Design a protein around this ligand. Structure first.
Ligand SMILES: Nc1ncnc2c1ncn2[C@@H]1O[C@H](COP(=O)(O)OP(=O)(O)OP(=O)(O)O)[C@@H](O)[C@H]1O
Lengths: 75, 1238
C-alpha cells in the first residue's frame, strides 16, 4: 500500500508518443501527383502544420528536462 | 595578492552516485568547461570589502541554492551577478557548483591554502568601534611618542594601509588621528578617542563627533551647528550592573537550546530568518540583512510574521548572543529583558514579571531600583516581547512604555502574530517583517539533524522536478520542524513524492502538540477547509469576512485558527489573507476526505457535488491531478473507490475530449499544465486514437493508486473492468499494474513503438514537382503577405533545431527500451495471455542482442502479433531468432520502405498464415513475397502499391490455383489497363465473396464487367479512372444498394447523361454515409442534383468536391443546410480554382448556420491567392456554427488585423483547434512587384 508514480519518468512516455505520431503521418504520391498534389499539398500542409505543433511542443515538453539534469551538477 | 590561470575542479569521485538519479555525469565536465571560459573573462581583481557588506551582495542571490549565504559569509565571498558566481576576495578563487557534503570553508581552505584564516589579516565583521576603541584605546596610553601636531603623527600612517591603501592618511590626519600600529587603529590624541574598520569613503569629520561628541580638538575647530548636520548618518540614535550578570547567566544557562522536541544535537542552530523592513508612510519594502538590522534598532520596532515562522527563535538568538562575546549590537547595552509572556498582561504586574526569568534571586529590584534607573540610562534598556494590542493595563509597558517614548525613547522588538498588527501599527515604527523562509536554511537545517544520508540528496531532485510545486512548499521552518521529527518512517523519509510526507506529517504534528482537546482543532480544520473546498471551485484567495460565514470560523479565532489562515495589512481596512497556495491545495483533500467518510451521508452529497465539477478528463490529468494525490494520500478506505467510480466514469466512450480545457487561472500555481495540456491537445490533434489511448493510462494510473490505499478487492474491481473494455494501451501499464495480479486482463489491445532515428528519404521533395508552376513569380500583394509565408529551409531548420534539444536528452541517457520488470512483472506469472500487441517500428537503431532478447520474451504470452514499420527496411531478418519460436504472428504487416529482399524468406519460413499485409511504397519481389504467396496465406485483405513501377500483373500468375478466403483486396492498374491485369483479377473475384475493394487508378479500358460484373455488396470502392468506361459506373456500379463510402476522382467525363446516369442512380440508390465525387466534366449544371436529393442520405459525413462551385451550389448547400437533411454531416470541402469566386462565399456564408454537426471545411489551392472583404463574413462563421475542431484555408493571406479578427473571434466558442492560414511554401522569392506601384 505505497503510492508509486514518477514525474522524472512521466516525461519519457511523453517523448515516446511524439515519435509515434510522426508515424501516423501518411501521404501518397501519384503518376499524376499534381492533381494529387492539389489535394496532397493541403494534406501535407495540414500534416506538417499539425506536426510542427507536435514536435514544437515535444521540445516544450522536454524543455524542462535539460535544466534539472544540468542544475543538479550545480545542485 | 591575486593570481592567474589555474582552472579549478569539481569532484568526479563520488559523483558516480548522482549518475543514477540523473542520466550521465560524463557530460557534467562539459558544463564546467564554461567556468574557466567564464572565470577568465571575469576580473580577477583584488580586495574590495570586509565581509559584513557581503550579505548585501546576496540580496538578489537566488534563494533556492544549496549553500547558505551565511556560509559564504564567513568565506566573505562577494556575490557577482554573472551566473551565480561567488568570489574569494583574499584568495582569488570563484565558485559556481555547490556541494551538499562540503562546506564552503573547505573549498576555500582546500583549494587556495593561502591568505584567509592563515591570517594575512584582511577583514573584520561584527564591527563595532568599541572593541576598537572603548576597551582598546585605554592601553593606547603612551601608545606613541609625543605628538602635538598632525604632521609628525601623519608619519605614523606609513605603516597603516595594507588593508586599505584607499582612504587617505591625509584626511585622518586632517582629522588628527594617530595610527598606533595595532591593526588599523587610529586615534584622536586630544579626546584620546580612536576608531577603525574604515569603509572607503568614511569621513572622520563625519565619524568623529558621532563617536566623540565631546572631543575638544574637534569642538575647538569644527564649531557646532555642523555637528547635527554631520550627526545624520546610518547607525541608530547613539549591584547596579550586577543584576545584569544574573540576566546574562540566566540565558547563559540552558533554557532555549533543545527547543525542537526531537533533540538538541545541535543546540545552537545557526540558520537565520530572512527579515524585511517595510516603510510605514510609502510602499518601499527595503530588504535587509540581519547584522544590518541590528544597528538599525531605534526605539520601538515591529518584528512581524505569522506563526511558527521563527517569531520567538529570532529574538532568542539575541540573548544567547547578548550574553556571549559577539556582533556589535549587543555590546552597547548592559540590559536586555526577554519576556514573551502574554500571561503577565492581565496582571497589574511587577518587576516579578521579570522574575519569571530571574528565577528569584531578586528583591532589591524595585521601581526605585528600576523605573528611574530604567530612565537613568535611556539606551541600555531593552525589552523582548511576545504580546500585542497594549490592552493589558500596566503602568510598566502600557501606561508608560509604548505610549510615551520621549520620556524614555527605548528600543523594543515585538513578536507579533500577523493578525495583531493592524490594531497597534500607528504607534509602531517602520516594519520589521519576514518575507518567508529561504529554501537554503532548510537545506542548512536538513544537513545538521541528519547524517546527510542521501536522503537530502534524494530531496532536491524532486525539488528540481517540481518547481512551483516545490520551491514554495516551505514557509514556516515549523514545516521543517514538522519534518524535524525525522523518525517518521526511519527518518524524514526514504520515500518519493516528498510533498505529502511533509504535509502528512505537519497535520498530525499539530495534533500531537495540540492534542489535549483536539475536538476544536478538527472542528476548526473541518470548518475552515470548506474554504479549501473552493480550491477546486476556483482560485479566489481573498476570502472576505462574508464567505468565512460558510466556513463559520470568523473572529472566533481560537489560537488554533492561526495555524492555517492569517490577515494582511490594508490599503483599505476590510481585507484578509491565507497561508500559501500549496498548503491550501492540501487542506482541500483533508477537508474533502472528511467528506466521503461513509459514516457521514447527508453531507457527503457536498463532495458528490464537487467531484462532479471535475468533468473533463483533462481536469484529471493536469488541473487537479497533483491534487488528487493528496486525496489518495490521506487514505480513508471507504471514500476512495466511490471517488474512483466518478473518475473511471469520466471517459464515457468515443467522446475524446468533452472540453479540452476548462482550465482556470488556477493553473499558474503549477506551470506544467500549460506544457502538458498543449502536448496533450497537440497529441490529440494528430491521432484521435492515441490521445484517448494516452489519457487512458494516467486515469488507470490515478485509478489503481486509490485502489492501493487499502482495498482493491471489493469496490475497486468492478469499476476498473468496465474502463478496460476495447481499449488500446502501452506496455508501460503492465509494470504499472500492482493490479497485474488479479487477472490476466482481457477486453483490450496494446501498442508498442520503437523509434531511435532521424528521418532519411526524399519523400517530401515532391514540391520539386510543383516547381513547374512558376512558384517564383506569383507572390504579389499584402505588405503582410510575407507573414503568410514560410520556406522549406525556414521550416526545415525550425524542426531540426528543435530535435537538437532532444539530441541533448538523447545522448546523456544510457537508455533504450522498456521492460525493467515491465515485461517481468508482466511475466512474473507464467500463464499470461495477451490478445494484441501493436508494434510500430522505424529504424534498426534498436537492433541489439539483449534489448531485443528482452523483446524476445515479450512476444511470448502475447497471442497476436502485429507490425508497422517505416525507416528500417531490414529489421525483419534482425528479428528471426526472436521469432524462431514460430510464434504465429499473423495479423498484418505494414510497410513503407523496402522489404529487404531475402528477408521475407523469413515471412515465407514463418508460415503463421497472416491475416493481412500492407505495403504501399518502394518495390516488391515475389522472391520477396509473391512466390508461392497463397499457399498458407489467403486470409484477409492485402495492399501492394507502387509508384510507377511495372510488373504488378506478374504479382500473381500463381494465384488462380489458390482458393481464397480473402474476399477483400486492394490493388491498382499500373498501366492503361493490360488484359493481363484483368485476366489476373478476373477469375479471382467470382470465386470469392467480394467484400471491400480498393483500386488506386483503375484504367477503365475494357471489360470492367470482368471487373465489376461480379462486384457485389462492397463498402470499400476506391477506383479512380484516368480513362473511363461509364457502363458499369452508370449501370451496375449503382445497382448494389448498401454502400457507405465512395472513393472517386480523376476527370468525370462529359456525358451529362452519364452524369445524370450517375446523378439519377446516385440519388436513386442512396444508402450512403459519404463518398468522393468524381472530378468534374463541366458537371456543374446538374450537380445541383448531386446536391438536391442528397438530403435523402440516411447518414452523412465526408462531403467531397474537387469541382462544381460558382453556380447556385452555395445556397444549394445552404438551403439543404438551413433546411434539414445535411444534419450530422461531418465534413465539407472544395479544391477548385475556376469554380473559386469570392462573390458567393458571402452568399455561401449568407446563412450557413444551424449545423453544429460538423468538423472541418477546406478552401484551398490558390496559385493566384484570394484576399477580399468576405473575411468580413468570417466574423459569423465559427460563432454560429458552434462545434468545429478546425478548418484549413490556404487562400486567406489575411490582414493580420483581419487575422486578429480571426484569432480574436476564434476562441469565443472554444479553447481549441484552429484554421491553418499558412502552408509551408516551397522556397521562393515572394516578390512585391505590385508594391512597385505605390
Ligand atoms: N533558524 C531556525 N532554525 C531552527 N529552527 C527554527 C528556526 N527558526 C524557527 N525555527 C523553529 O520554528 C519555530 C518558530 O516559532 P516561534 O516559537 O518563533 O513563534 P512563537 O513566538 O512561539 O509564536 P508561534 O509559535 O505562533 O510562531 C520555533 O519553535 C523553532 O523551533
Amino acid at each position: 500500500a505505497a503510492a508509486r508514480l514518477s514525474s522524472g519518468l512521466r516525461i519519457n512516455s511523453a517523448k515516446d508518443d511524439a515519435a509515434g505520431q510522426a508515424i501516423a503521418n501518411s501521404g501518397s504520391g501519384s503518376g499524376s501527383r499534381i492533381e494529387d498534389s492539389d489535394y496532397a499539398t493541403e494534406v501535407s500542409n495540414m500534416s506538417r502544420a499539425q506536426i510542427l505543433q507536435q514536435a514544437g511542443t515535444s521540445v516544450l515538453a522536454q524543455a524542462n528536462q535539460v535544466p534539472q539534469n544540468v542544475l543538479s551538477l550545480l545542485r | 595578492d591575486r593570481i592567474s590561470e589555474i582552472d579549478y575542479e569539481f569532484l568526479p569521485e563520488l559523483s558516480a552516485l548522482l549518475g543514477v538519479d540523473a542520466f550521465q555525469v560524463a557530460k557534467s565536465q562539459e558544463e564546467e568547461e564554461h567556468k574557466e571560459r567564464m572565470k577568465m573573462k571575469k576580473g580577477f581583481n583584488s580586495q574590495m570589502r570586509s565581509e559584513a557588506k557581503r550579505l548585501k551582495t546576496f540580496e538578489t542571490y537566488d534563494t533556492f541554492r544549496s549553500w547558505t549565504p551565511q556560509e559564504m559569509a564567513a568565506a566573505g565571498f562577494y556575490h557577482t551577478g554573472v551566473r551565480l558566481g561567488v568570489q574569494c576576495f583574499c584568495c582569488s578563487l570563484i565558485l559556481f557548483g555547490n556541494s551538499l557534503r562540503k562546506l564552503p570553508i573547505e573549498r576555500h581552505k582546500k583549494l587556495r591554502p593561502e591568505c584567509e584564516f592563515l591570517q594575512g589579516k584582511d577583514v573584520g565583521n561584527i564591527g563595532k568601534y568599541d572593541i576598537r576603541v572603548k576597551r582598546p584605546e585605554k592601553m593606547l596610553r603612551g601608545g606613541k611618542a609625543r605628538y602635538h601636531e598632525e604632521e609628525a603623527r601623519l608619519e605614523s600612517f606609513e605603516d597603516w594601509p595594507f588593508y586599505a591603501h584607499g582612504t587617505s592618511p591625509r584626511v585622518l590626519s586632517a582629522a588628527g588621528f594617530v595610527f598606533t600600529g595595532k591593526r588599523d587603529t587610529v586615534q584622536c590624541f586630544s579626546c584620546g578617542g580612536s576608531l577603525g574598520n574604515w569603509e572607503e569613503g568614511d569621513d572622520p569629520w563625519k565619524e568623529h563627533a558621532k563617536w566623540f561628541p565631546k572631543c575638544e580638538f574637534l569642538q575647538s575647530k569644527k564649531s557646532s551647528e555642523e555637528i547635527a548636520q554631520y550627526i545624520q548618518s546610518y547607525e541608530g540614535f547613539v549591584s547596579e550592573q550586577l543584576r545584569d550578570n544574573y540576566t546574562k547567566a540566566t540565558f547563559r544557562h540552558m533554557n532555549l537550546p533543545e527547543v525542537c522536541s526531537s533533540l538538541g544535537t545541535d543546540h545552537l542552530l545557526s540558520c537565520d530568518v530572512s527579515i524585511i523592513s517595510k516603510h510605514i508612510s510609502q510602499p518601499v519594502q527595503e530588504a535587509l540583512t540581519i547584522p544590518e538590522v541590528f544597528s538599525n534598532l531605534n526605539s520601538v520596532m515591529c518584528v512581524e510574521g505569522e506563526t511558527g515562522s521563527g517569531k520567538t527563535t529570532f529574538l532568542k538568538r539575541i540573548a544567547f548572543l547578548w550574553a556571549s562575546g559577539c556582533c556589535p549590537l549587543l555590546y552597547r547595552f548592559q540590559l536586555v529583558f526577554y519576556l514573551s509572556l502574554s500571561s503577565i498582561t492581565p496582571d497589574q504586574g511587577l518587576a516579578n514579571i521579570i522574575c519569571a526569568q530571574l528565577l528569584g534571586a531578586g528583591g532589591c529590584i524595585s521601581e526605585v531600583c528600576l523605573s528611574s534607573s530604567i530612565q537613568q540610562l535611556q539606551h541600555q534598556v531593552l525589552f523582548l516581547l511576545d504580546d500585542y494590542s497594549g490592552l493589558a493595563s500596566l503602568p510598566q509597558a502600557l501606561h508608560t512604555l509604548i505610549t510615551k517614548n520621549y520620556l524614555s525613547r527605548t528600543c523594543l522588538l515585538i513578536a507579533v502574530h500577523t493578525n495583531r498588527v493592524r490594531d497597534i501599527r500607528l504607534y509602531l515604527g517602520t516594519s520589521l517583517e519576514i518575507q518567508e523562509f529561504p529554501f537554503y536554511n532548510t537545506v542548512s537545517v536538513l544537513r545538521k539533524f541528519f547524517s546527510h544520508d542521501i536522503i537530502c540528496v534524494e530531496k532536491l531532485i524532486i525539488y528540481f522536478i517540481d518547481n512551483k510545486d516545490l520551491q514554495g512548499v516551505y514557509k514556516t521552518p515549523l514545516f521543517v520542524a514538522a519534518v524535524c521529527t525525522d523518525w517518521i518512517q526511519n527518518a524524514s523519509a526514504q520515500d518519493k513524492f516528498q510533498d505529502v510526507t511533509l504535509f502528512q506529517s505537519y497535520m498530525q504534528y499539530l495534533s500531537l502538540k495540540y492534542k489535549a482537546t483536539a475536538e476544536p482543532l478538527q472542528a476548526t480544520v473541518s470548518s475552515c477547509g470548506q474554504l479549501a473546498l473552493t480550491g477546486l471551485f476556483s482560485s479566489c484567495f481573498e476570502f472576505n469576512s462574508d464567505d468565512l460565514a460558510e466556513a463559520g470560523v470568523d473572529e472566533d479565532e481560537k489560537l488554533t485558527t492561526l495555524l492555517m489562515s492569517k490577515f494582511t495589512a490594508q490599503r483599505l481596512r476590510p481585507v484578509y489573507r491565507f497561508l500559501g497556495p500549496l498548503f491550501q491545495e492540501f487542506l482541500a483533500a483533508v477537508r474533502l476526505t472528511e467528506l466521503l467518510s461513509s459514516d457521514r451521508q447527508e453531507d457527503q452529497d457536498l463532495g458528490l457535488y464537487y467531484l462532479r465539477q471535475i468533468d473533463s478528463p483533462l481536469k484529471a490529468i493536469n488541473s487537479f491531478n497533483i491534487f488528487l494525490y493528496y486525496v489518495s494520500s490521506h487514505s480513508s478506505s471507504k471514500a476512495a473507490p466511490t471517488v474512483v467510480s466518478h473518475l473511471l466514469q469520466l471517459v464515457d466512450e468515443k467522446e475524446s475530449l468533452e472540453n479540452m480545457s476548462e482550465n482556470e487561472d488556477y493553473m499558474k500555481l503549477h506551470p506544467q499544465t500549460f506544457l502538458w495540456f498543449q502536448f496533450v491537445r497537440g497529441l490529440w490533434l494528430v491521432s484521435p486514437e492515441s490521445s484517448s489511448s494516452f489519457v487512458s493510462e494516467h486515469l488507470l494510473r490515478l485509478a489503481l493508486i486509490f485502489a492501493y490505499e487499502s482495498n482493491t478487492v471489493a469496490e475497486c474491481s468492478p469499476f476498473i473492468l468496465q474502463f478496460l473494455r476495447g481499449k488500446t494501451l502501452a506496455l508501460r501499464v503492465l509494470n504499472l499494474q500492482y493490479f497485474r495480479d488479479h487477472p490476466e486482463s482481457l477486453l483490450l489491445l496494446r501498442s508498442l513503438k520503437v523509434s531511435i532515428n532521424g528521418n532519411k528519404m526524399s519523400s517530401y521533395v515532391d514540391y520539386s514537382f510543383k516547381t513547374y508552376f512558376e512558384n517564383l513569380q506569383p507572390p504579389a500583394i499584402d505588405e503582410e503577405y510575407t507573414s503568410a509565408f514560410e520556406h522549406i529551409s525556414e521550416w526545415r531548420r525550425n524542426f531540426a533545431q528543435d530535435e537538437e534539444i532532444i539530441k541533448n536528452y538523447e545522448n546523456i541517457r544510457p537508455r533504450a527500451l522498456p521492460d525493467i520488470s515491465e515485461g517481468y512483472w508482466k511475466l512474473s506469472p507464467k500463464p499470461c495471455k495477451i490478445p494484441k500487441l501493436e508494434v510500430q517500428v522505424n529504424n534498426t537503431d534498436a537492433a541489439d542482442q539483449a534489448l531485443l532478447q528482452v523483446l524476445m520474451e515479450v512476444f511470448s504470452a502475447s497471442q497476436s502479433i502485429e507490425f508497422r514499420l517505416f525507416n528500417s527496411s531490414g529489421f525483419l531478418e534482425s528479428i528471426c531468432p526472436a521469432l524462431e519460436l514460430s510464434k504465429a504472428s499473423v495479423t498484418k504487416c505494414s510497410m513503407s520502405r523496402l522489404e529487404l529482399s531475402r528477408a521475407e524468406q523469413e515471412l515465407l519460413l514463418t508460415l503463421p498464415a497472416l491475416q493481412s499485409l500492407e505495403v504501399s511504397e518502394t518495390n516488391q519481389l515475389p522472391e520477396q513475397l509473391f512466390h508461392n504467396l497463397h499457399k498458407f496465406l489467403g486470409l484477409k485483405e492485402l495492399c501492394v502499391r507502387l509508384d510507377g513501377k511495372p510488373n504488378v500483373l506478374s504479382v500473381l500468375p500463381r494465384e488462380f490455383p489458390n482458393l481464397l478466403h480473402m474476399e477483400k483486396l486492394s490493388i491498382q492498374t499500373s498501366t492503361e489497363s493490360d488484359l493481363s491485369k484483368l485476366v489476373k483479377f478476373i477469375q479471382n473475384f467470382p470465386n470469392l465473396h467480394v467484400f471491400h475493394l480498393k483500386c488506386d487508378f483503375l484504367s477503365n479500358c475494357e471489360s470492367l464487367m470482368a471487373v465489376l460484373a461480379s462486384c457485389k455488396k462492397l463498402r470499400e470502392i476506391e477506383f479512380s479512372g484516368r480513362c473511363f468506361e461509364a457502363m458499369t459506373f452508370v449501370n451496375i456500379l449503382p445497382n448494389f444498394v448498401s454502400l457507405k463510402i465512395l472513393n472517386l476522382k480523376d476527370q468525370q467525363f462529359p456525358d451529362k447523361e452519364t452524369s445524370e446516369k450517375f446523378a439519377q442512380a446516385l440519388g436513386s440508390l442512396r444508402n450512403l454515409e459519404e463518398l468522393l465525387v468524381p472530378t468534374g466534366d463541366g458537371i456543374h449544371q446538374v450537380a445541383k442534383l448531386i446536391v438536391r436529393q442528397c438530403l435523402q442520405l440516411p447518414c452523412l459525413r465526408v462531403l467531397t468536391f474537387h469541382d462544381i462551385l460558382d453556380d447556385d451550389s452555395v445556397i444549394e448547400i445552404a438551403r439543404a443546410a438551413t433546411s434539414g437533411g445535411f444534419q450530422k454531416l461531418e465534413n465539407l470541402d472544395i479544391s477548385m480554382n475556376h469554380k473559386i469566386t469570392e462573390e458567393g462565399y458571402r452568399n455561401f456564408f449568407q446563412a450557413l448556420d444551424n449545423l453544429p454537426n460538423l468538423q472541418e471545411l477546406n478552401i484551398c489551392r490558390n496559385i493566384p491567392g484570394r484576399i477580399q472583404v468576405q473575411a468580413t463574413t468570417v466574423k459569423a462563421l465559427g460563432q454560429c456554427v458552434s462545434r468545429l475542431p478546425s478548418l484549413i484555408r490556404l487562400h486567406m493571406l489575411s490582414w493580420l488585423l483581419d487575422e486578429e479578427d480571426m484569432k480574436v473571434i476564434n476562441d469565443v466558442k472554444e479553447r481549441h483547434p484552429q484554421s491553418k492560414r499558412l502552408i509551408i511554401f516551397w522556397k521562393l522569392i515572394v516578390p512585391f512587384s505590385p508594391v512597385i506601384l505605390e
